[PDB]
Design an enzyme around this catalytic site. Structure first.
Site, PDB file in Angstrom:
ATOM      1  N   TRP B 280     -19.493  -9.466 -30.342  1.00 59.38           N
ATOM      2  CA  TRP B 280     -19.271 -10.501 -31.070  1.00 59.38           C
ATOM      3  C   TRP B 280     -19.986 -11.936 -30.708  1.00 59.38           C
ATOM      4  CZ3 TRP B 280     -15.107  -8.038 -30.208  1.00 59.38           C
ATOM      5  CH2 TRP B 280     -14.031  -8.276 -28.879  1.00 59.38           C
ATOM      6  N   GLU B 285     -24.390 -18.933 -27.912  1.00 60.72           N
ATOM      7  CA  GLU B 285     -26.194 -18.559 -28.977  1.00 60.72           C
ATOM      8  C   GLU B 285     -26.533 -19.439 -29.943  1.00 60.72           C
ATOM      9  OE1 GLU B 285     -25.499 -14.445 -28.198  1.00 60.72           O
ATOM     10  OE2 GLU B 285     -23.778 -14.573 -27.775  1.00 60.72           O
TER      11      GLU B 285
HETATM   12  C1  HEM Z   1     -17.690  -8.226 -27.857  1.00 56.08           C
HETATM   13  C2  HEM Z   1     -18.429  -9.510 -27.621  1.00 56.08           C
HETATM   14  C3  HEM Z   1     -19.718  -9.777 -26.673  1.00 56.08           C
HETATM   15  C4  HEM Z   1     -19.681 -10.855 -26.284  1.00 56.08           C
HETATM   16  C5  HEM Z   1     -19.190 -11.932 -26.397  1.00 56.08           C
HETATM   17  C6  HEM Z   1     -21.065 -10.885 -25.020  1.00 56.08           C
HETATM   18  C7  HEM Z   1     -21.701 -12.034 -24.448  1.00 56.08           C
HETATM   19  C8  HEM Z   1     -23.071 -12.191 -24.677  1.00 56.08           C
HETATM   20  C9  HEM Z   1     -24.029 -12.723 -24.305  1.00 56.08           C
HETATM   21  C10 HEM Z   1     -23.318 -14.216 -24.428  1.00 56.08           C
HETATM   22  C11 HEM Z   1     -24.884 -12.569 -23.865  1.00 56.08           C
HETATM   23  C12 HEM Z   1     -26.590 -12.923 -23.470  1.00 56.08           C
HETATM   24  C13 HEM Z   1     -27.085 -13.315 -24.990  1.00 56.08           C
HETATM   25  C14 HEM Z   1     -28.710 -13.891 -24.375  1.00 56.08           C
HETATM   26  O1  HEM Z   1     -28.275 -15.273 -24.450  1.00 56.08           O
HETATM   27  O2  HEM Z   1     -29.868 -13.209 -25.612  1.00 56.08           O
HETATM   28  C15 HEM Z   1     -24.989 -11.352 -23.395  1.00 56.08           C
HETATM   29  C16 HEM Z   1     -25.940 -10.324 -22.973  1.00 56.08           C
HETATM   30  C17 HEM Z   1     -25.857  -8.553 -22.853  1.00 56.08           C
HETATM   31  N1  HEM Z   1     -24.830  -8.431 -23.855  1.00 56.08           N
HETATM   32 FE1  HEM Z   1     -23.346  -8.669 -24.044  1.00 56.08          FE
HETATM   33  N2  HEM Z   1     -21.666  -9.763 -25.293  1.00 56.08           N
HETATM   34  C18 HEM Z   1     -21.355  -8.811 -25.915  1.00 56.08           C
HETATM   35  C19 HEM Z   1     -21.049  -7.389 -26.380  1.00 56.08           C
HETATM   36  C20 HEM Z   1     -21.749  -6.678 -25.856  1.00 56.08           C
HETATM   37  C21 HEM Z   1     -22.097  -5.058 -26.080  1.00 56.08           C
HETATM   38  C22 HEM Z   1     -21.107  -4.158 -27.142  1.00 56.08           C
HETATM   39  C23 HEM Z   1     -22.836  -4.776 -25.351  1.00 56.08           C
HETATM   40  C24 HEM Z   1     -23.499  -3.188 -24.913  1.00 56.08           C
HETATM   41  C25 HEM Z   1     -22.526  -2.187 -25.667  1.00 56.08           C
HETATM   42  C26 HEM Z   1     -23.200  -5.164 -24.478  1.00 56.08           C
HETATM   43  C27 HEM Z   1     -24.506  -6.151 -23.618  1.00 56.08           C
HETATM   44  C28 HEM Z   1     -25.038  -6.471 -23.789  1.00 56.08           C
HETATM   45  C29 HEM Z   1     -26.768  -6.341 -23.239  1.00 56.08           C
HETATM   46  C30 HEM Z   1     -27.211  -5.423 -22.467  1.00 56.08           C
HETATM   47  C31 HEM Z   1     -26.697  -8.123 -22.544  1.00 56.08           C
HETATM   48  C32 HEM Z   1     -28.381  -8.641 -22.020  1.00 56.08           C
HETATM   49  C33 HEM Z   1     -29.625  -8.592 -23.077  1.00 56.08           C
HETATM   50  C34 HEM Z   1     -30.317  -9.056 -22.517  1.00 56.08           C
HETATM   51  O3  HEM Z   1     -30.514  -8.459 -20.960  1.00 56.08           O
HETATM   52  O4  HEM Z   1     -31.561  -9.293 -23.569  1.00 56.08           O
HETATM   53  N3  HEM Z   1     -22.943  -6.650 -24.168  1.00 56.08           N
HETATM   54  N4  HEM Z   1     -23.902 -10.714 -24.359  1.00 56.08           N
HETATM   55  N1  LIG Z   2     -23.275 -11.189 -28.231  1.00 64.10           N
HETATM   56  C1  LIG Z   2     -24.542 -10.551 -28.683  1.00 64.10           C
HETATM   57  N2  LIG Z   2     -25.545 -11.500 -28.193  1.00 64.10           N
HETATM   58  C2  LIG Z   2     -26.932 -10.490 -27.982  1.00 64.10           C
HETATM   59  C3  LIG Z   2     -28.153 -11.961 -28.582  1.00 64.10           C
HETATM   60  C4  LIG Z   2     -29.344 -10.939 -28.446  1.00 64.10           C
HETATM   61  C5  LIG Z   2     -30.483 -12.174 -28.437  1.00 64.10           C
HETATM   62  N3  LIG Z   2     -30.334 -13.121 -29.770  1.00 64.10           N
HETATM   63  C6  LIG Z   2     -32.043 -11.822 -28.297  1.00 64.10           C
HETATM   64  O1  LIG Z   2     -32.109 -12.107 -29.007  1.00 64.10           O
HETATM   65  N4  LIG Z   2     -31.976 -10.296 -27.082  1.00 64.10           N
HETATM   66  C7  LIG Z   2     -33.338  -9.845 -27.444  1.00 64.10           C
HETATM   67  C8  LIG Z   2     -33.906  -9.711 -25.708  1.00 64.10           C
HETATM   68  C9  LIG Z   2     -34.298 -10.943 -24.491  1.00 64.10           C
HETATM   69  N5  LIG Z   2     -34.376 -11.268 -23.130  1.00 64.10           N
HETATM   70  C10 LIG Z   2     -34.329  -8.884 -27.641  1.00 64.10           C
HETATM   71  N6  LIG Z   2     -32.453  -8.130 -28.529  1.00 64.10           N
HETATM   72  O2  LIG Z   2     -35.251  -8.027 -28.336  1.00 64.10           O
HETATM   73  N7  LIG Z   2     -24.776  -9.047 -28.176  1.00 64.10           N
HETATM   74  N8  LIG Z   2     -22.978  -8.647 -28.552  1.00 64.10           N
HETATM   75  O3  LIG Z   2     -23.677  -7.412 -28.830  1.00 64.10           O
HETATM   76  O4  LIG Z   2     -21.937  -8.991 -29.242  1.00 64.10           O
END
Ligand code: HEM
Ligand SMILES: N=C(NCCC[C@H](N)C(=O)N[C@@H](CCN)C(N)=O)N[N+](=O)[O-]
Ligand code: HEM
Ligand SMILES: N=C(NCCC[C@H](N)C(=O)N[C@@H](CCN)C(N)=O)N[N+](=O)[O-]
Ligand SMILES: C[C@H](O)[C@H](O)[C@H]1CNc2nc(N)[nH]c(=O)c2N1
Ligand SMILES: C[C@H](O)[C@H](O)[C@H]1CNc2nc(N)[nH]c(=O)c2N1
Ligand SMILES: OC[C@@H](O)[C@@H](O)[C@H](O)[C@H](O)CO
Ligand SMILES: OC[C@@H](O)[C@@H](O)[C@H](O)[C@H](O)CO
Ligand SMILES: [Zn+2]
Lengths: 407, 410
Positions: B280, B285
């Site tokens: 979520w 973001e």
């Molecule tokens: C449930 C609440 C979740 C919140 C509030 C949360 C929040 C975030 C936020 C704020 C970021 C930075 C996104 C950005 O600036 O592009 C992030 C990155 C990331 N999250 Fe979470 N996340 C959540 C769930 C998940 C889940 C379900 C997974 C995987 C099973 C996950 C995997 C990752 C990964 C691998 C990244 C880095 C993505 C990248 O390098 O571009 N997140 N998350």
């Molecule tokens: N809160 C989340 N945020 C993920 C948001 C993805 C982000 N806006 C994005 O554009 N990520 C690029 C990676 C940029 N390093 C992509 N998925 O190609 N994730 N979630 O599981 O709850």
């Protein structure tokens, strides 16, 4: 071996070749990044001196010249005989300016070449240090039109006659722990504030009491001195709309002047080298005023703005934060005291980075420190990849003297 | 070796021993830090050891390390690799793997939720239509009428590299971007290239400011196919402000389910190239990046004008003032519509508690400070003041090149 850096907002890519000159360690390894960590002999000396002098003569377009070679040998014989050496005034100036140019955590380096250098290597006592310092403060303050400057005291000899400014900055507010258990004044200076008392100072016990200078010359015990009050410019903080702001009783000094770092030039170590430029607004409004371990005034301000402080999601802390920073900038500008906002400073740093990559092949920069403490992504540096590496001449951290001085 | 990390606001110091199990490289060297750089077929040879390490970790996690079950599984997998050059994970191992890839994700601030991930096993999937069905089910489950539940759907692992399963979308749900002849952009600038590919593949673009993109799905290395996600399954929130009635007229809205679909999940040496996951949103973001990045919707000006701020000079901090209001609006709208969302204060506070817990029970918590600190109000959040150690642990989520750059068209 030729790294590239990209700005994800403009797509501009710059190539870095300067990092190939770095010698010192970063703290990081191929297995772990320590980028967010705050603090990660005659035979040793000549090579350092040579590295420095080579870059100096190259800067003046006389690399390989007889003068270059002559100087190199002169210093060489001086180290072999005296176990140390003395920089020429020109080398000193070039060195201090480049230590600033090389400071990867400084966002205001676009100003690097304009540094006024004060040579205090002829200083011998704490009273002489006080005099040089007052002169630096007066010069740098310039009635509000701040000018960057550094004052360089004698270099380290055997390590037992080091010159040191015990203060963290030339101008700071005292901090005292009250009966309540709370803290009056600046919590960051609680310990230094007591060391001053621990031997003389008479504290007014106020919230904004200018600390006295604790100067150490030639390794002797430090002496106290009160900076001529008339030389310490302060700005009362008010808001351009919230008339109740002034009632908070807030003010800050106009001259930021780091005085506890160590300047290394051609292997020589200057343990007392206070320098000053001017403030970026967020330094005061975000960090000094809103850090929970500092003046921590967010709640008070939120209460006066009558914001719903019941839930974090109302973003009351954020709203109060912006107001506090608008006040700071407004106040300094109103009193005609130099200050720069985070938008303008970061914009200048990006311009500087480009200049540096073009004319120098790179610019060491520490993203963690360069990105402002508020509104990060709306400033251009947030979107700018940066390579952090160490180049000398350099400004380094050094242990607080009270943890090393033998009274 | 023990490594200390300190929090400069509380002086709490933690000791990291977990970094000792880090295998992958960071990009940094003893001479240069690349902490702010965005992006700095296996052999039977290089696979069993990777498998062994994982199974050892898995079995130790269930308190069966060294057991007969543990030894048999290692023998079973070894024979399988020698026999087929690869191997299949048991459902339990896949679940453990996916949860840990999240747990090990250094750039994720939401990891306090890691153990609650719902894993959907889609390894029996063989076609793009099959992928669409699995993805529709993921979106419906995860959305849960606004009470979001974290989930991941895992398609067949890579075999020879010519039969990869890939979701061409960067996220399951995103808005189209259209570059106009006059050089301006309609919609989300971040998705212009992918939108052009969709159009070229046959998508009839409504060319609006918020058109939900169709899914472009690749199964078994075949050319990708287009599918429209049932509109009734895509939850969206109109953005309005609690005090500014003109905000709603800005015509803004955002989807409620963030679902990254282009990363590679590595478990025990196996590579899952299609593994869409969702949780979520943290408000910033949307409110800071999607709406205020100059390269995205870039709405700061329009908002600043309506608030009648002094935009003649940056020192009025009009950009910062407008920024806060927009983020207030995003949180207010989601909460009003009862769609899960977390503000940056709550999320960073929870992450610090999670991090300390991990140090105590796991010996560490790899974290990327550059990504963890929110894009606004950085220092008024606890993470700003927290020293972090960034290193790579497996299982893990990795970046992979966009498929249109590597796909061999048939
Ligand atoms: C449930 C609440 C979740 C919140 C509030 C949360 C929040 C975030 C936020 C704020 C970021 C930075 C996104 C950005 O600036 O592009 C992030 C990155 C990331 N999250 Fe979470 N996340 C959540 C769930 C998940 C889940 C379900 C997974 C995987 C099973 C996950 C995997 C990752 C990964 C691998 C990244 C880095 C993505 C990248 O390098 O571009 N997140 N998350
Ligand atoms: N809160 C989340 N945020 C993920 C948001 C993805 C982000 N806006 C994005 O554009 N990520 C690029 C990676 C940029 N390093 C992509 N998925 O190609 N994730 N979630 O599981 O709850
Ligand atoms: C004239 C305009 C100047 C501006 C606006 C400026 C701004 C900044 C800012 C905002 C910081 C971070 C401060 C903190 O968070 O504690 C900083 C750090 C630093 N600046 Fe500059 N600076 C200026 C001049 C100078 C000068 C004159 C020198 C040296 C001669 C210098 C050396 C440094 C160094 C070495 C650091 C890092 C210090 C540390 O690690 O604590 N700066 N500067
Ligand atoms: N704008 C400047 N800001 C410097 C602010 C120094 C900062 N407030 C400070 O307390 N630094 C600690 C070091 C903390 N890393 C010290 N010098 O003891 N510098 N200038 O010359 O223009
Ligand atoms: C732990 C973390 O390194 C620490 O809080 C840093 C982050 N970035 C900073 N950036 C600046 N300019 N000044 C600081 O004091 C800090 N503190
Ligand atoms: C250049 C710099 O690394 C880049 O802009 C990073 C900074 N921190 C970030 N943090 C998060 N969460 N998301 C991002 O996209 C980024 N971008
Ligand atoms: O009270 C003394 C402190 O100001 C001092 O220990 C500083 O924390 C130190 O000089 C580093 O900034
Ligand atoms: O329009 C294409 C982009 O969305 C795509 O190339 C992304 O930049 C990539 O998936 C990384 O986020
Ligand atoms: Zn690093």
């Amino acid at each position: 071996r030729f790294l590239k850096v990209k700005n994800w907002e403009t797509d501009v890519v710059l190539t870095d070749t300067l990092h190939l000159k770095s010698t010192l360690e970063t703290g990081c390894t191929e297995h772990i990044c320590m980028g967010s960590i705050m603090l990660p002999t005659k035979d040793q000396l000549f090579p350092l001196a040579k590295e420095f002098l080579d870059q100096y003569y190259s800067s003046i377009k006389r690399f390989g010249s007889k003068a270059h070679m002559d100087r190199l040998e002169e210093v060489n014989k001086e180290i072999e005989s005296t176990s140390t050496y003395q920089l020429k005034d020109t080398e000193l100036i070039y060195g201090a300016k480049h230590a600033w140019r090389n400071a990867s955590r400084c966002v205001g380096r676009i100003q690097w070449s304009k540094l006024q250098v004060f040579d205090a290597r002829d200083c011998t006592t704490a009273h002489g240090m006080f005099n040089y310092i007052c002169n630096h403060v007066k010069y740098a303050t310039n009635k509000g039109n701040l000018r960057s400057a550094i004052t360089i005291f004698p270099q380290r000899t055997d390590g037992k006659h080091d010159f040191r400014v015990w203060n963290s900055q030339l101008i700071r507010y005292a901090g005292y722990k009250q009966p309540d258990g709370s803290t009056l004044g600046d919590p960051a200076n609680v310990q230094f504030t007591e060391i001053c008392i621990q031997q003389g100072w008479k504290a007014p016990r106020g919230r904004f009491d200018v600390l006295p200078l604790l100067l150490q010359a030639n390794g002797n015990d430090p002496e106290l001195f009160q900076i001529p009050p008339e030389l310490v410019l302060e700005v009362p903080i008010r808001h351009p709309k919230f008339d109740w702001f002034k009632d908070l009783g807030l003010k800050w000094y106009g001259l930021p002047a780091v005085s506890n770092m160590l300047l290394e030039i051609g292997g020589l170590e200057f343990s007392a080298c206070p320098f000053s430029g001017w403030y970026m607004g967020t330094e005061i409004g975000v960090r000094n005023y809103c850090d929970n371990s500092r003046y921590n005034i967010l709640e008070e301000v939120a209460k006066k703005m009558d914001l719903d402080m019941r839930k974090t999601s109302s973003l009351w802390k954020d709203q109060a934060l912006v107001e506090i920073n608008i006040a700071v900038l407004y106040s300094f500008q109103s009193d005609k005291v130099t200050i720069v906002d985070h938008h303008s400073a970061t914009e200048s740093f990006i311009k500087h980075m480009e200049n540096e990559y073009r004319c120098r092949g790179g610019c060491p920069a520490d993203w963690v420190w360069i990105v402002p403490p508020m509104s990060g992504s709306i400033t251009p540096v947030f979107h700018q990849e940066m390579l952090n590496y160490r180049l000398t001449p350099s400004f380094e951290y050094q242990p607080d003297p009270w943890n090393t001085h033998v009274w």
